[PDB]
Structure formats: structure tokens, C-alpha cells
Amino acid sequence: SGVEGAAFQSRLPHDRMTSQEAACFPDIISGPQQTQKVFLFIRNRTLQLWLDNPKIQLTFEATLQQLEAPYNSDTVLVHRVHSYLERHGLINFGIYKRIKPLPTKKTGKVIIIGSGVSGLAAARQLQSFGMDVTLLEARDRVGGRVATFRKGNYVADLGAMVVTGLGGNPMAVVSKQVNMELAKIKQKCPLYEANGQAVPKEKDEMVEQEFNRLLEATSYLSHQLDFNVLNNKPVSLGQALEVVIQLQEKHVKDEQIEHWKKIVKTQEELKELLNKMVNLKEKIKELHQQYKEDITAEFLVKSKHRDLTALCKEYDELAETQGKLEEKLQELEANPPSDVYLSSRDRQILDWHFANLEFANATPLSTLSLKHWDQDDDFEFTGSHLTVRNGYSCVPVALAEGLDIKLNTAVRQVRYTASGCEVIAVNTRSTSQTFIYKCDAVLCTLPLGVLKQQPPAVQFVPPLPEWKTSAVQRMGFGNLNKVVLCFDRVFWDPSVNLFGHVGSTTASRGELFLFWNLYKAPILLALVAGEAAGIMENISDDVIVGRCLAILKGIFGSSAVPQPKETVVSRWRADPWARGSYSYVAAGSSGNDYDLMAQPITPPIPRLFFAGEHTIRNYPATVHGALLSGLREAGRIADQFLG
Ligand SMILES: Cc1cc2c(cc1C)N(C(=O)CCc1ccccc1)c1c([nH]c(=O)[nH]c1=O)N2C[C@H](O)[C@H](O)[C@H](O)COP(=O)(O)OP(=O)(O)OC[C@H]1O[C@@H](n2cnc3c(N)ncnc32)[C@H](O)[C@@H]1O
Numbered sequence: 001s002g003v004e005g006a007a008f009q010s011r012l013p014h015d016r017m018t019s020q021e022a023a024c025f026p027d028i029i030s031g032p033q034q035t036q037k038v039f040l041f042i043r044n045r046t047l048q049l050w051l052d053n054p055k056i057q058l059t060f061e062a063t064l065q066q067l068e069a070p071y072n073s074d075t076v077l078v079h080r081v082h083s084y085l086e087r088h089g090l091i092n093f094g095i096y097k098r099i100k101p102l103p104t105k106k107t108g109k110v111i112i113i114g115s116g117v118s119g120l121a122a123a124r125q126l127q128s129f130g131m132d133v134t135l136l137e138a139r140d141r142v143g144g145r146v147a148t149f150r151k152g153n154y155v156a157d158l159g160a161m162v163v164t165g166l167g168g169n170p171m172a173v174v175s176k177q178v179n180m181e182l183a184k185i186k187q188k189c190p191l192y193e194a195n196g197q198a199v200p201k202e203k204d205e206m207v208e209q210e211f212n213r214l215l216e217a218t219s220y221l222s223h224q225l226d227f228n229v230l231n232n233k234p235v236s237l238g239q240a241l242e243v244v245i246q247l248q249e250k251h252v253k254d255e256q257i258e259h260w261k262k263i264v265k266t267q268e269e270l271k272e273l274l275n276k277m278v279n280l281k282e283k284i285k286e287l288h289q290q291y292k293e294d295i296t297a298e299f300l301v302k303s304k305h306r307d308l309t310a311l312c313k314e315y316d317e318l319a320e321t322q323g324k325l326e327e328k329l330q331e332l333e334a335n336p337p338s339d340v341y342l343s344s345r346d347r348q349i350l351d352w353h354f355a356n357l358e359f360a361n362a363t364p365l366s367t368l369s370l371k372h373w374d375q376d377d378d379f380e381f382t383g384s385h386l387t388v389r390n391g392y393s394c395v396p397v398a399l400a401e402g403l404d405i406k407l408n409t410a411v412r413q414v415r416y417t418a419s420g421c422e423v424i425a426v427n428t429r430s431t432s433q434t435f436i437y438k439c440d441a442v443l444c445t446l447p448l449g450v451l452k453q454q455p456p457a458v459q460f461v462p463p464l465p466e467w468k469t470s471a472v473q474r475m476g477f478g479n480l481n482k483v484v485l486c487f488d489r490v491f492w493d494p495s496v497n498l499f500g501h502v503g504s505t506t507a508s509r510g511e512l513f514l515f516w517n518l519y520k521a522p523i524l525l526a527l528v529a530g531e532a533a534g535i536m537e538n539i540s541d542d543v544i545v546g547r548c549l550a551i552l553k554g555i556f557g558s559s560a561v562p563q564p565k566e567t568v569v570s571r572w573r574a575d576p577w578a579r580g581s582y583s584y585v586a587a588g589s590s591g592n593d594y595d596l597m598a599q600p601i602t603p604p605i606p607r608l609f610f611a612g613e614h615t616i617r618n619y620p621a622t623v624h625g626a627l628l629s630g631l632r633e634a635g636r637i638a639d640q641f642l643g
Pocket residue numbers: 113114115116117118119136137138139142143144145146158159160161162163164360409410411412445446447450457458480481482572576577578580581582611612613614620621622623624626
């Protein structure tokens with residue numbers, strides 16, 4: 001399944017047209033189904049050609065010469081399919097050699113705000129489509145939230161660092177195009193408690209199994225018993241979790257109660273049984289006395305005998321039904337149900353898994369929408385997640401080649417009228433001087449964190465619509481930070497990619513909870529997640545580094561941990577050009593706000609467009625999602641301005 005593999009790798013069903021294709025090829029969708037079969041094959045075959053060699057441009061001509069008969073005969077259809085794929089960035093995207101050099105005459109002028117992956121991806125597209133495009137970047141570097149520290153042989157990422165599984169991922173293509181070195185993340189992640197001692201394989205697996213059950217339970221509560229609203233306020237994932245933990249504690253307590261009752265019932269039956277046995281002894285003594293007096297005794301002894309014995313066929317008979325209790329009893333007081341749901345240490349290890357989830361969503365669990373936090377799960381790529389061994393910055397740096405990028409240029413105002421656009425920016429090195437860039441269309445790739453900023457960092461004239469600003473306000477924008485520790489010696493386990501540090505309280509579970517071993521040089525990355533991420537931004541590098549060394553010394557022993565030669569600490573929330581790490585579906589929002597974010601603002605025809613990780617519903621908060629959003633908008637614009 002080569003052509004089949006291609007559809008897959010492009011995130012398309014290999015045997016049916018998508019709604020997009022139906023819209024663009026209405027004559028094929030509503031027409032002979034035999035012609036649809038041909039369409040799909042032409043489409044899957046062109047994707048294959050491009051994906052097999054993403055380093056070179058795939059022209060309309062070269063596609064025609066490589067299709068086999070009878071397909072290479074339908075010149076018009078092939079062209080219609082090739083243009084559609086190219087326009088929408090499914091082929092000829094990223095960085096590749098042009099065999100058809102760009103035309104000197106550039107049609108339409110577009111200003112892209114932001115030189116991060118979404119902006120660079122869109123930039124290159126628009127440029128290859130023959131448009132005039134300039135990017136205005138506030139930082140003194142490209143990449144935005146993809147940031148790599150490089151000094152000597154030290155390489156460490158302060159922004160994105162993980163690639164999520166190649167099958168279906170457009171980064172698979174970019175990876176080959178920029179020669180980026182990827183390494184699969186080894187699953188083994190040892191956990192150490194606050195005292196520095198490892199958590200036993202047993203408990204590790206047990207708590208992780210509870211973590212999974214607890215989550216599955218919230219999913220059931222949400223998508224089945226529709227428990228998504230309480231007191232008119234939407235329910236958060238954190239909220240649902242604590243409720244499910246409570247029910248578990250209640251159940252444990254209930255089985256504890258029932259058991260104690262079995263003990264007490266058995267204990268009463270015994271006490272009562274002992275008491276009548278004592279009375280039967282007192283009844284037997286009444287006989288092993290009296291019994292012995294006269295001459296009729298040959299009948300009086302027989303009598304007192306078959307009498308005194310019958311009271312033993314009674315007594316030791318009770319000692320029997322007595323042994324069946326002491327047995328039942330000792331068996332119960334030896335097999336008690338669980339005393340608690342989670343011990344105090346167990347709850348700490350569980351909190352580690354929760355911090356892990358707060359890392360992934362870049363936000364405290366109490367802020368996540370119980371119903372839509374994992375709204376995009378259905379679009380995951382297949383395969384192992386990888387790590388970028390040579391620094392993820394190699395991507396935006398390569399995507400920047402040949403583009404007109406203006407660094408240290410912070411946009412402060414965006415005016416869009418029914419007949420053109422003006423973007424006002426200021427040099428960040430001399431806020432004295434401003435710049436005024438005229439253009440036909442503005443592509444805003446500003447982070448949702450900047451768009452939420454109050455007072456506003458950039459102004460919109462006219463102001464953006466209420467349906468757009470309301471969406472910006474509902475959506476969540478998280479935070480996540482890393483501490484890069486650069487040493488001259490490796491004192492950790494070189495075979496382990498990651499290891500965890502379990503925190504002492506629920507509140508600080510996200511403080512330096514996960515360490516990463518990813519690079520050539522002796523470097524360790526420590527994560528700060530959930531509630532701890534924003535707070536820690538207020539502590540200086542030195543103090544924060546200190547706390548890392550302490551954790552580290554508690555695990556490998558002091559004297560094993562030397563002082564770092566170099567350290568880098570991110571503070572994404574404080575970063576004016578970001579205002580956080582990435583979006584998350586907040587409670588009260590949903591995947592529809594990601595769609596609304598993508599909507600262009602048009603006063604008589606579309607003028608203001610949007611891209612960036614917060615504008616792609618099926619791939620939010622990711623580097624690839626940022627890439628696709630870029631390709632998406634370059635398409636939407638070329639359609640408006642070039643047709
Ligand atoms: C900050 C951050 C972000 C991410 C991560 C860690 C951290 C600490 N990574 C993760 O830890 C994992 C995430 C993850 C998520 C999902 C699955 C698996 C993992 C991570 C991860 N994503 C991913 O796929 N794998 C990852 O490994 N993210 C998120 C991505 O970094 C992010 O979604 C993506 O880079 C966003 O790109 P955009 O183009 O949408 O935004 P940005 O790069 O910020 O571009 C905006 C530009 O605008 C510029 N700018 C601003 N204000 C102005 C102005 N006024 N004028 C002119 N220019 C301006 C600003 O400086 C930027 O250059």
C-alpha cells in the first residue's frame with residue numbers, strides 16, 4: 001500500500017474524498033464514482049511522489065511523466081489535482097530545491113506578524129506562490145516558541161523539544177528536509193521520592209494503574225453520564241478527579257465498616273456461646289456431685305450415667321461449634337480490607353502522574369475542561385514520540401532561508417480597511433523610530449498569550465469583533481518552564497532518557513518533577529509544571545538551580561553532583577513575546593474556539609488572517625499544529641488574492 005501509505009502520511013483517507021476535495025471538485029463528487037476512484041488514485045500517487053523525495057520540488061510536469069497509463073493521459077485532471085495539493089501545502093512544503101525558479105514579478109503584498117513556525121511555514125508558501133511577503137519579528141531571532149540554547153558543544157531546547165510520532169506527522173517531512181536528528185524516547189522513567197529513594201517497580205505500576213483508572217472514570221462520568229456542569233459552572237478535569245478520588249475513599253471506608261461488623265458479630269456469637277457453656281459446666285458439676293447415692297443404684301447409677309454423659313454430648317458438641325467460630329474469627333482479623341485508598345506516600349506518587357498531565361497540558365488540572373481537554377485525541381499520530389538531539393531550532397532556522405525577515409521589529413498596531421492594510425511597528429532597539437508597512441493582507445501569528453494581553457500589546461483598527469475577542473478570552477493559555485543544567489561530567493544513568501522527582505505536597509507537585517537526559521554533552525533538563533510554573537518564575541536562576549542540585553544530590557548523592565558550568569532558565573509567562581507556553585482547552589471553552597480563532601476578519605473582503613498553535617483545532621498546542629496552520633492560511637490567502 002504505497003499510494004495508501006501516502007494518503008495516511010498526509011492525514012487523508014486513501015479511499016474516499018474529504019469534504020475539502022468535494023468542495024473543490026464538485027464535478028467529481030457528484031458524478032461517476034469511477035471518476036472518483038481515478039481522482040483518489042491521482043491524489044494518492046502525487047502525494048507518494050512528493051513524500052518519497054521531499055527534498056526537491058514536485059512539478060505538474062514531473063507528476064504527469066511519472067503517473068502510469070491511463071492516468072498520464074488525463075492531463076487536465078492531473079493538473080487540477082496537482083494544483084489543489086500544492087495550493088493547500090500537501091506537496092512542495094517546507095524546504096526543498098526549486099527546479100522551477102521563482103518569477104521576478106511578485107503579485108500581492110502580505111505582512112506576516114511573527115516569525116515562529118506558523119509564520120515561517122506560511123511565509124515560504126506565499127513566497128513560492130509568487131507573492132510579496134515580509135515577516136515582522138519582535139525578537140532578535142526566528143523560531144518563537146522553538147528556542148534552542150547553543151554554546152560550544154552544549155545543545156538544549158528551552159521551548160518545544162518533542163516530536164510526537166511520525167506516522168501522519170508533517171514534521172516527518174521537515175525532519176528529512178533539514179536533516180534533524182531524532183531519538184525515540186526510552187519508556188523507562190524511574191521515580192524517586194523526596195528523600196531521594198527510588199520507588200519500587202511494584203508501587204510504580206500500581207499507582208500508575210490507579211492514575212489510569214481514575215482518568216478513565218472521569219471520561220465515563222463526562223461522556224456517558226454527562227456530568228459536565230455543576231452550579232452552572234462547567235466542570236474541570238481536576239474537579240472530576242477529586243470527586244472520583246472521594247468516591248474511592250468512600251468505598252474503602254464502606255468495606256472497612258462491613259468487615260468490622262463481621263468481626264463484632266462473630267465476637268458476640270462467641271461471647272454468648274462461651275456464656276452458655278459456662279452454665280453447662282455449672283450444670284455438669286451439679287452432677288459430678290449428688291450423683292453417687294441408693295441400692296436401687298444399679299438403676300440409679302445407670303440413670304445418672306446416661307444423664308451425665310448426655311450433658312457431654314451437649315458440651316464438647318458446643319466446643320465444636322465453638323471452634324468453627326474462633327476459626328472464622330481469626331480468619332477475618334487476619335484478612336482485613338484496605339485500610340485506606342491511598343497512603344500518604346501513595347498520594348504523592350499519584351500527584352506525580354498528575355503533575356505529568358499538567359506538564360502535557362501546560363496548565364493546572366483544575367483549569368482544564370473536563371469534557372473537551374482531550375478534544376483532539378482522535379488526531380494523534382502513530383509511532384514513538386522522539387526528542388530532537390541536535391536542537392529543535394534547526395527547523396525554523398532552515399525555514400527562514402531566503403525570506404525577508406525583519407528582526408527586532410515589534411508590531412504595535414494593525415489597521416485593516418475595505419481597501420488595504422497598514423501595520424505599525426517599532427524598533428525594539430530604539431522605540432523612538434517606528435515603521436509603517438502597507439499591504440493587501442495581514443497574517444497574524446501572534447501567540448494567544450499576546451492576544452489576551454491587557455492592556456493590549458498590539459492594537460487592532462477597527463477593534464476585533466466581539467465573537468473573536470470572546471473566543472480569545474475563553475481559551476486557555478498555559479505555562480511551562482525548564483531549567484537547563486550544563487555539567488562537564490555525566491553522573492546520571494546514560495541509558496535512561498527521563499527520571500522523575502516526586503514532590504512533597506499536592507500544591508507543588510509540578511516543581512522540578514521531571515528530568516530529561518537528551519543531549520550529546522552532559523546536560524539535564526528539569527521541568528516546572530502546573531501551579532509551580534508561574535510561581536517559580538519569581539525565583540532567581542541561582543536559587544532555582546540550587547533546588548535542582550538538592551533534588552539531584554538527594555538521588556545520586558552529593559559529591560556525585562558537581563556545580564554546573566552553565567545554566568539556562570526559561571520564564572515563558574514573563575516573556576512579553578509569548579506570555580506563556582501554549583493553549584489548552586479551558587473549562588468553559590471547547591474545540592470551537594480554535595475554529596473561531598482561525599476565522600479571517602473582513603470588514604468587503606477578507607483582510608486580516610490568523611495562524612499559530614491556537615488556531616488549529618485538531619492539532620493545538622504543537623509544533624506540527626503550528627506548521628499546518630501556516631500552510632492552511634497561505635492557502636486561504638492565495639485563493640483570495642491570486643485566485
Ligand atoms: C514554550 C513551550 C512550547 C512547547 C513545548 C515546550 C515549551 C516550554 N513543548 C513541549 O514541552 C511539549 C508540547 C507537547 C504538546 C503536544 C504534544 C506533545 C508535546 C512542545 C511543544 N510543541 C510540540 O509539538 N512539542 C513540544 O515538545 N510546545 C508548543 C510549541 O512550541 C508551539 O505550539 C509552537 O512553537 C507555536 O508556534 P507559533 O508560530 O504558533 O507561535 P510562536 O512560535 O510563539 O510564534 C509567534 C511569533 O510572534 C512573535 N511576536 C510576539 N509578539 C510580537 C509582536 N508584537 N510583534 C512582532 N512579533 C511578535 C513571537 O516572538 C514569535 O516569534
